[PDB]
Symmetry: D2
Subunit: 287 residues, 4 copies
Amino acid sequence: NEDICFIAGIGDTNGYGWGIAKELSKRNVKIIFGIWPPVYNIFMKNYKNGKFDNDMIIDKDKKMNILDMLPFDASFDTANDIDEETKNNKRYNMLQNYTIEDVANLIHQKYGKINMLVHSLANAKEVQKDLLNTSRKGYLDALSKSSYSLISLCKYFVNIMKPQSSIISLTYHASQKVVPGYGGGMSSAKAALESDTRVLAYHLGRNYNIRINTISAGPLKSRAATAINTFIDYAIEYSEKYAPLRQKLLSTDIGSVASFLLSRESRAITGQTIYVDNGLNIMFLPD
Amino acid sequence: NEDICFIAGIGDTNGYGWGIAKELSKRNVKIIFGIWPPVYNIFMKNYKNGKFDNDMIIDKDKKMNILDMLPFDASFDTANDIDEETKNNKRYNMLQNYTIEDVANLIHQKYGKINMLVHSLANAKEVQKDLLNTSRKGYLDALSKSSYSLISLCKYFVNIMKPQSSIISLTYHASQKVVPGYGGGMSSAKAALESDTRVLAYHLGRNYNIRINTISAGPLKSRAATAINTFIDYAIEYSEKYAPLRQKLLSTDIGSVASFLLSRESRAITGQTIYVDNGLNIMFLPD
Amino acid sequence: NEDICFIAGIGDTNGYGWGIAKELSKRNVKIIFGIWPPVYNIFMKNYKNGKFDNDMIIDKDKKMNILDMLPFDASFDTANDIDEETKNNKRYNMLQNYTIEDVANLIHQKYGKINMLVHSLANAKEVQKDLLNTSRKGYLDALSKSSYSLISLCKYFVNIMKPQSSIISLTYHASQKVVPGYGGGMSSAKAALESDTRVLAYHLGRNYNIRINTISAGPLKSRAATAINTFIDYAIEYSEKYAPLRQKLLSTDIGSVASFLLSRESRAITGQTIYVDNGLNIMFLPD
Amino acid sequence: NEDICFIAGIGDTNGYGWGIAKELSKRNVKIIFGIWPPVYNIFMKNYKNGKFDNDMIIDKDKKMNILDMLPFDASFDTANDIDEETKNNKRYNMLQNYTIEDVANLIHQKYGKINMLVHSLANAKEVQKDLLNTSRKGYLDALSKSSYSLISLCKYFVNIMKPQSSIISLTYHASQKVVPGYGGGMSSAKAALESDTRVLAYHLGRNYNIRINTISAGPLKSRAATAINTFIDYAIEYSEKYAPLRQKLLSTDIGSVASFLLSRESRAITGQTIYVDNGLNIMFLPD
Ligand SMILES: NC(=O)c1ccc[n+]([C@@H]2O[C@H](COP(=O)([O-])OP(=O)(O)OC[C@H]3O[C@@H](n4cnc5c(N)ncnc54)[C@H](O)[C@@H]3O)[C@@H](O)[C@H]2O)c1
Ligand SMILES: NC(=O)c1ccc[n+]([C@@H]2O[C@H](COP(=O)([O-])OP(=O)(O)OC[C@H]3O[C@@H](n4cnc5c(N)ncnc54)[C@H](O)[C@@H]3O)[C@@H](O)[C@H]2O)c1
Ligand SMILES: NC(=O)c1ccc[n+]([C@@H]2O[C@H](COP(=O)([O-])OP(=O)(O)OC[C@H]3O[C@@H](n4cnc5c(N)ncnc54)[C@H](O)[C@@H]3O)[C@@H](O)[C@H]2O)c1
Ligand SMILES: NC(=O)c1ccc[n+]([C@@H]2O[C@H](COP(=O)([O-])OP(=O)(O)OC[C@H]3O[C@@H](n4cnc5c(N)ncnc54)[C@H](O)[C@@H]3O)[C@@H](O)[C@H]2O)c1
Ligand SMILES: Oc1cc(Cl)ccc1Oc1ccc(Cl)cc1Cl
Ligand SMILES: Oc1cc(Cl)ccc1Oc1ccc(Cl)cc1Cl
Ligand SMILES: Oc1cc(Cl)ccc1Oc1ccc(Cl)cc1Cl
Ligand SMILES: Oc1cc(Cl)ccc1Oc1ccc(Cl)cc1Cl
């Protein structure tokens, strides 16, 4: 009782963020969605029009427990970072308090302190280009939004979290082994994310008694996965054929693991990269 | 509601085997203990005398549900491997059906098929010697009882397990990084165990849809630990002083993680080495 | 014969860049220094005043073979990236062709194609702050100069390198394990550098038959090492006391390894992170 | 000028042992071969008949300098370990002083102290069986001859080695990632070998200032390789098709790296697993 989780990085019901929300709901955790402004209105519309009613179904008729839905952009740390153009952009103009600091303050004011935080986002302008051809701007854009965002989320949210709270993010094996197609510096961003998870585990553990881990998920055909041009269909096919466990990897498979890591049951685990990919990562040569 | 777990390697209530049994009990899992013959009667004596009553208490009105307790020696695969020096041994003479295959048949004959298996045993005759001074006989003894026993357990128990069953063992970071007092080939045995966990994950996964993982636990002042050369006293002191999470590591901390890995909740995790050590493994230079 | 190496990241004779240059000279490799503009003039002055004559001594009277010394700033990819302020800054005003593209073109025009490239630089404005307190700007600054610079160096220099050429950079273990004190996102930058080394190994290997590896060096009291405030004295003391090899780590120790990796003798090694740290990285618990 | 290397594990000129001998010869290192008794006479026969003359050619007017060739069985530590089944064996009856301790004393008695040691042997009676179906006897046989033999070699040879000496062994990536046809416990043996290399690095480093590393080599169609179950044909085909460097891996490619690790040039490297496989180990999803 009293478990509140903020999930940053939800634009629909086809990604891991939604799978994580469903499993947490089964444990009676209250959910707060952090939605990227560019897709905020479209998300709300569909929600209002009851387009997600089926996907919100859990257990036996059990409906998901969505406490709130807030506009959120991990590119901005404070209101002072918002550039004039973005502030005046059509999709941002009518929204407020969407920077990392503002959302933390908003959540604290409305619901008090929370104990669960999920970083389920990533972005790279040049993801379609191989690392060698990625520009400096594209590279830094990937690191800024996909990696630094985690650090910033921690810096502002630790002030509104209870001791013994837990934090998780999502990564991918391309950080440790070569996956052609995963460009734009996304591999670089994930490698940084995994390393930052260890350093943050040290600081957050000693000073706040807070835990942080990352889940290296297998392939899922999410909206963003298609942006890589297809790459995702190949990855899924390869996984279902060569993984030690030949079964379809579901968003809820990652969700149940996320639920465990966020609960007090994983009290002694921190700074780890946990693989939830049907064991594919352990293979060397296929069959 | 129908889950049965065989825990191989319990001689008292101060080790990880007991902690795992306690946590699985909270989930209403029926427990069967595999006890090393040399200490079987003494264990039985204490149990009867109520020396473990307090250690069996769980939650409010809940007691640990121990289905059965059987003599079990991981040194012998089948009845044919029992030598006269053992058969004629005082402690073994009074016991029967304690080889790996016999225990599997006995359990199956009495309770049917099971779906959870825990390997929580290690043994090395020359653990007090550094690797360089360990004899061939001592080295092989460690690998035989601490590593091969996992493979043999799987070979014989898969026949009495249900599909989608799960298996776990315990390892230690000395397999990956140097820990001076961890001798006799125990470091070697743990390295083989972690690698074997991957290979078995592939075979058991493809052929039976069965999962297998290993938990790399932090220091716990248990019975066997005290045999290493005080060493455990150092390890614990160091862990509690430098680990990112400054809290005492409890056998049940490993238990709750084991319980999760043995349930369907971790359906997509296999062949992994999961660290449950308060994050100590991530540190390099002590602060 | 005909071996030319460009070493990017030399501001004096106290770092690894100089140690790498000395060892390469022993193999009769022609050296070209890439010097950061802010310290370019001071470097030349000392050189001219013969302040480095002693340090240039190799073998028996054998003097180093410095082919050229060029101003170089890894922050700029092309002349178009140079901001008006920097272009007009006192130390840059009188220098030309110091961007990555210009230096590559300059080298090609003056000496033709080369076959050896060394990335021996790093920088982070907020290195004195722990990761949690590093600003977005500081973080991206670290990644831009310490990691992306490697990718850019490769993109422009592969056009002026012969097939079978070799490239190396320098990293540090803080990317894999926690080292308190290594802040400003330097740990993040090194993790990215190591991951990018693997991805680049794939692209450069398949398309140009060029190799790339990185050396994870132990502590050396270089000029930059002092910028971390001391941290470096502690690291050196810890290393000389706990490493399996209790000896002083010299810049030339890294130099000789760099020489091997850059030569044709390491033909089958690529995408690797090679540790040259007296074996400290393999230790878990000290003595 | 005074370097002597003992290479344990040579039965012909198609393996890595020969490639290592060739490269060390270019450096004028005196070579002593340790030959498995069962094939000692045949080897000697071919040598006398000049069947290896072409394989011994190096550079222009340079021939491989083989100091001596001795029968050597890594299964026996001392004369006391020789059983009647072996002593009475036809192939062993005619030979003497072939245990590890005897060879060390014999070499020392004839040529004095040495400074280079190479462990290039592996053996597993049930290599054709997958791990799950490998017997205890077969599993232990693999660990005894392929892993413990390294420890015993160090224990007995340090007495006849000079300070600052170097040692290397060969391993394979199947210890870290799953390779289906690599059975009989060879994967287990390699995992132990790599871990043991770290522990030994600590002991030999602190006590004798002696270094030890292991080379993880790529596929090479050798004599023993052909015993795995064609498998080697697959491995080679896969390596040459997907590795970042599309070139044939030669025994001398491993030889040049071995030569470097055995020289003073690598003075600061110890306890490491160095990959010499054209970078194949860094790949995840084949392109
Ligand atoms: N889908 C997969 O196959 C897969 C594999 C490994 C890891 N994960 C990781 O899981 C996370 C989500 O992946 P997914 O596939 O479910 O994607 P989605 O399902 O695309 O989720 C990503 C979310 O990020 C949001 N987002 C983008 N930029 C943002 C910004 N600046 N501020 C705030 N939100 C922003 C998007 O609007 C979107 O809802 C990422 O970290 C991804 O790398 C996914
Ligand atoms: N104690 C720790 O700090 C620690 C750290 C890492 C991993 N674990 C691992 O957990 C397992 C148990 O450790 P523990 O500390 O709880 O020890 P215990 O508490 O000593 O548990 C080991 C059990 O093995 C049994 N055993 C020994 N030889 C046997 C044989 N031939 N057949 C059957 N059973 C046999 C013993 O009787 C004992 O009950 C081991 O694998 C150990 O390496 C423990
Ligand atoms: N010294 C150590 O203990 C140590 C340990 C591990 C790795 N290495 C790595 O070796 C490299 C050099 O380290 P070092 O200690 O010898 O340092 P130095 O000896 O400080 O070398 C770094 C060089 O980078 C140059 N530089 C900084 N910003 C630049 C820019 N924008 N463009 C071009 N040049 C720039 C400096 O002027 C300097 O000459 C770095 O990558 C460092 O992280 C060093
Ligand atoms: N062949 C490859 O592709 C490959 C890949 C990775 C690592 N390496 C490793 O290199 C080493 C040699 O491999 P290789 O392919 O050159 O094989 P060979 O070319 O088969 O070399 C192995 C040698 O071990 C000797 N041997 C076997 N049992 C022995 C015993 N009891 N005592 C003494 N010598 C004994 C054999 O007679 C033989 O000369 C092994 O450790 C192997 O695992 C080889
Ligand atoms: O990390 C991922 C891994 C896979 Cl296999 C599929 C999708 C992934 O997620 C992303 C990839 C690129 C961008 Cl730009 C944004 C996101 Cl969310
Ligand atoms: O693996 C372990 C790690 C630690 Cl820190 C403490 C105890 C451990 O467990 C053992 C060590 C040696 C032997 Cl002979 C038997 C066991 Cl059960
Ligand atoms: O990587 C390093 C590791 C160590 Cl132990 C010492 C110095 C290092 O190098 C740097 C650290 C911070 C900045 Cl800003 C620049 C450089 Cl060159
Ligand atoms: O380790 C190896 C790896 C590969 Cl790919 C090919 C051959 C190898 O070497 C062996 C394998 C099994 C046995 Cl019984 C003996 C040896 Cl020498």
